[PDB]
Design a protein around this nucleic acid. Structure first.
Ligand SMILES: Nc1ccn([C@H]2C[C@H](O)[C@@H](COP(=O)(O)NP(=O)(O)OP(=O)(O)O)O2)c(=O)n1
Ligand SMILES: [Mg+2]
Ligand SMILES: [Mg+2]
Length: 342
DNA sequence: CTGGGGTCCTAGGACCCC
DNA sequence: GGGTCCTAGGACCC
């Protein structure tokens, strides 16, 4: 039923806002991540740092081994939040059909738009431009008839570029497209798929659908459909936050309950403030806790609960601390609430 | 040498209904 | 024998 979807993605979003504000970081390797002393990971890295192999979700310990002159910045969320809200208002000028996927990211449906005539290519081009003129940062775009193809397209000519995929180009695009580039196919599934000899969508096009439903369930249908180019998901501008969590990893494993309670005492005020901005009465559906151990196993305990309550969080945290710790060190403790169904 | 914020999926037992 | 809720956990995303 061919639609036209624009996936915009900010390039090096967190880093780019650090460089715009201080140009001294424009041409030196910078990353936002948090110290190796605090056991942190890289969240964003500029291209000078990317040249050394620094990627997002990489432990800072390895980021420094690869690029020792990394200037690590901690990040200013409100600086990135304002930029985003500006980005989303720039989208508001071309369609109401806007589905943000994060701060730096949004699906735009422009099928029924009158703007740069009907050219999804020129709308994406002008949005990418207006962002630069108004925020001095750069965007990439992808244009496709479906959601995931427009997302894959947003990475192909980045940074500061776009890439269009028309319906006639789709069959050739999918034939060589490796399965792991499909959003929702990460490291584990890509490894089993390659264990079955499935690397590209061209390979799964020659597969049996009932076979894939046997082995992967609902995931096998999604797999088989994306390879045929099928992605009926609508751009939904109505999607709502469903949960609020606050967690913290300490410098080193903590071994006594006394220390773990000292962390919850600090975590709770932050969780309440962030819950208050969205729900002033603090009324919720479930609240609970999370511990992650030295062997990186993690357990959570959540239960029905009417209102964000600190003592019950401490209480339940010691029940896990006793029943499921088994004497290992603890590197992370976290708090959580599940919001009420709208 | 492994973050912090989330979404979505699965699955067994409890629970309720015929 | 059905269905929805409850809970824990895992894969995945930015
Ligand atoms: N694992 C990750 C991935 C992204 N992020 C944050 C930091 C990024 O600046 C922001 C943008 O997500 P992203 O698109 O995946 N990466 P980024 O936009 O910075 O670089 P490119 O999109 O140009 O590849 O999300 C994170 O905190 N942890
Ligand atoms: Mg980006
Ligand atoms: Mg993004």
């Amino acid at each position: 039923g061919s639609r036209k979807i624009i996936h915009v993605d900010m390039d090096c979003f967190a880093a780019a806002v650090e460089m715009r504000d201080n140009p001294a970081l424009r041409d030196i390797p910078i990353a936002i991540g948090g110290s190796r002393e605090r056991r942190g990971v890289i969240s964003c890295a500029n291209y000078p740092a990317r040249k050394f192999g620094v990627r997002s979700a990489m432990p800072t310990g390895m980021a420094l081994k690869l690029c020792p002159h990394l200037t690590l910045l901690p990040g200013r969320f409100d600086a990135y939040k304002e930029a985003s809200n500006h980005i989303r208002e720039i989208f508001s000028r071309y369609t109401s059909r806007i589905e943000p996927l994060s701060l730096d990211e949004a699906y735009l449906d422009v099928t029924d738009s009158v703007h740069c005539h009907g050219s999804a290519t020129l709308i994406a081009q002008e949005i990418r431009q207006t962002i630069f003129n108004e925020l001095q940062l750069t965007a990439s775009a992808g244009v496709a008839p479906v959601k995931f193809l427009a997302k894959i397209a947003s990475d192909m000519n980045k940074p500061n570029g776009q890439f269009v995929i028309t319906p006639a180009e789709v069959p050739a695009f999918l034939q060589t497209l490796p399965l792991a580039k499909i959003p929702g196919v990460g490291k584990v599934s890509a490894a089993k798929l390659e264990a079955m000899g499935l690397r590209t969508c061209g390979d799964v096009q020659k597969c049996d659908l009932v076979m894939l439903l046997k082995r992967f369930g609902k995931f096998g249908r999604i797999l088989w459909e994306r390879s045929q180019g099928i992605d009926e998901r609508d751009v939904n501008s109505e999607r709502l936050r469903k949960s609020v969590g606050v967690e913290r990893t300490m410098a080193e494993d903590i071994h006594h309950w006394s220390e773990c309670e000292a962390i919850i005492e600090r975590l709770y005020p932050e969780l309440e403030r962030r819950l208050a901005k969205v729900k002033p009465d603090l009324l919720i559906a479930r609240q609970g806790v999370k511990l992650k151990f030295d062997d990186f196993q993690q357990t959570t305990q959540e239960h029905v609960w009417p209102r964000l309550n600190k003592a019950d969080l401490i209480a339940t945290a010691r029940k896990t601390w006793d029943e499921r710790r088994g004497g290992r060190g603890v590197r992370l403790v976290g708090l959580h609430v599940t919001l009420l169904d709208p």
